[PDB]
A paper describes a structure:
Homologous recombination is a ubiquitous mechanism for maintaining genome integrity and also for generating genetic diversity in sexual reproductive organisms. This reaction is catalyzed by RecA family proteins, including bacterial RecA, archaeal [name], and eukaryal Rad51 and Dmc1. The current model holds that, in the presence of ATP, the recombinases coat a primary single-stranded DNA (ssDNA) to form a nucleoprotein right-handed helical filament, and initiate a search for a secondary homologous stretches of double-stranded DNA (dsNDA). By contrast, archaeal [name] is a better model for eukaryotic recombinases.
Here we report additional three new crystal structures of left-handed helical filaments. First, the basic structural element of these three new helical filaments is a [name] dimer. The other protomers were then assigned as [name]_B, 2ZUC_B and 2ZUD_B, respectively. A unique property of these left-handed helical filaments, as compared to other known structures of RecA family proteins, is that their DNA binding motifs (i.e., L1, L2 and NTD) are all located at the outermost surface of helical filaments. Moreover, the NTDs are separated a long way from L1 and L2 motifs. We found that the locations of the L1 and L2 motifs in the four left-handed helical filaments are relatively conserved, but in contrast, the NTD locations are quite different. The first hinge region, located between the NTD and the PM, is referred to here as “subunit rotational motif 1 (SRM1)”. Subsequent structural and biochemical analysis revealed that SRM1, a hinge region between the NTD and the PM, is not only responsible for structural flexibility of the NTD but also is important for [name]'s function in promoting D-loop formation.
Author numbering:
A (entry chain B), B (entry chain A): 13 to 258, 279 to 322
The structure:
Amino acid sequence: TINDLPGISQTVINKLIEAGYSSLETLAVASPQDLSVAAGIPLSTAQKIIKEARDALDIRFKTALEVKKERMNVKKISTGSQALDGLLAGGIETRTMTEFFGEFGSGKTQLCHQLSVNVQLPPEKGGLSGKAVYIDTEGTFRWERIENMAKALGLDIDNVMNNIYYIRAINTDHQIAIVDDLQELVSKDPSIKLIVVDSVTSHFRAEYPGRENLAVRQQKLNKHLHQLTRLAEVYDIAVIITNQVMHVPGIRIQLKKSRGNRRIARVVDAPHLPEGEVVFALTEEGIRDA
Amino acid sequence: TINDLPGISQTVINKLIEAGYSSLETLAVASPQDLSVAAGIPLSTAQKIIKEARDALDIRFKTALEVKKERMNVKKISTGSQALDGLLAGGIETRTMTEFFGEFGSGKTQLCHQLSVNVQLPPEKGGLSGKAVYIDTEGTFRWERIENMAKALGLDIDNVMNNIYYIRAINTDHQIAIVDDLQELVSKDPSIKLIVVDSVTSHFRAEYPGRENLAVRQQKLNKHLHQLTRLAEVYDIAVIITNQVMHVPGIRIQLKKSRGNRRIARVVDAPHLPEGEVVFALTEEGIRDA
């Protein structure tokens, strides 16, 4: 869980794990001299790691200055829930693939829809003034939902629906291919800033079912995810995937159910993001607060 | 505020609030014959209450010499609105918690940035030459604001944004843990004279739905608010908490809206401070008068 340390070499990371320092919490409670003599690492390097080890575990107060730097440095998309935006240090981020996995109805879909709409807002409103691309794997798209979310944001339905490139991926090959053709699609239309793949694992599970296949599944399935990650990294766009459930980087968020209207959000895998969970709701207007 | 009026039959206190004479300041400046014929209440009694309505907000005439003493004797943070400053008899005090509450847009938030910028100025300019710590609860912070405010006050934008410690509280457990560390922070940096928690109860209301674990939402909130109050009292620091709404808090100022720009402030409670209300405005420069 330490592979994500600010300004750190890969060589040392190894030496760190070798020495026996697996988690960031072991490094945290460590003494510079100790970690230094137990893995080569110059004394200056030993303490830099320890410092950064804490910053992730402990609470530190940045300054409104650094904040301005970051805010205008990278850019994110708002989910519609202030609570969730927080869990996501602002929201869905470009140049990175964020995944929402959770049981059926956990929020996954509505959130994909919400983002295909919110991405069109302006930076002032948690948007990036751009278009989305929804890749309907199991046939989950619902315009009745886009309309309601557009309505809530008092936007031109028609127009909002025209800013969402849509497409059905019926089997893995088509899923693999459509994605292959995203490079071209974005080149032709640079206003695209969001790629959405609902149920990415879906066909891969259907076609290569069982453990008798589990191997080459995650395999072909990881090559797919990389194709997506590379695209988000090269075109500076956000990629969102959903995986339905009861090692490919990017944020992984778990959605869960609470009493009827409410849902729980929790950070699983993610470097720059603070662990902990927050609640939000699924209303008629869409992904919003409780 | 009139319920607690000198020797008065509750039956009449009704006829008053029933005529609309809620606030004491309005009674104080009313006509015994215009009031008598408003709540039927006799002239004898009418007069007897208008006179008692004045002694209430009891006005004291000091010499310009007295006031120049007291103004220095006690350093308060101005708000940009001399009317609001008046309502607060100078400004926000240190070693005390002040609460602004009202509907989204009441000003409570901008008034927070305003303060995070004015605390930096020196006493003569309305500040305390201190630093501010902004605790973002629902993502209300905005740097473009701390900018326009630094601009209007002709400050060094960069240096103003460097004197504000910032941090977002994704949930209650976190909010709570940040305030615990708040103690250690002011020891670390004594230059801090202002703390601001925007929407203290946001997460509490949302994570403790309906009225259930209220056992602790309340137990927890108290220890959380008292905690902040010690902070202020022990470290000669001014503490500010906002609260959005459609027993501890030193001062409680309610804010309300008027025509899209003007906002009303009213002393809902606070020992010293003279009950009554005033009107200010939200400008591109910041919090000013109208």
